[PDB]
């Protein structure tokens, strides 16, 4: 089998407090299934109250249907197959918080 290669997923460059993001952890080759885990610097994402994840054997969407400032920071998702590894890391940066 081929070992999987990470197709690159970011976030939006201007992240307002309150509104949603979704990005798309997903390959451009390698043999399914394939396997996702998500981090937030660290920490189990999906269990943020947040954060929901739609996984399947091709990809994994995380979904943060309220961003708060709790969500700021590095989101790693690690995907697997038998064959092989790879690993993409995005920073959520918030340009505008709650201001009223």
Known sequence: GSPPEIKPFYFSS????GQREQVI??????DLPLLFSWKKDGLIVENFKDITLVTNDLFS??????????????????????????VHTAALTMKVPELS
């Open 61 to 86: 969407v995380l979904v943060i249907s309220s961003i708060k400032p709790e969500h700021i920071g590095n989101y790693t998702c690690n995907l697997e197959n038998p064959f092989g590894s790879d």
């Open 14 to 17: 201007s992240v307002q407090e």
């Open 25 to 30: 952890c997903s390959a451009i080759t390698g």
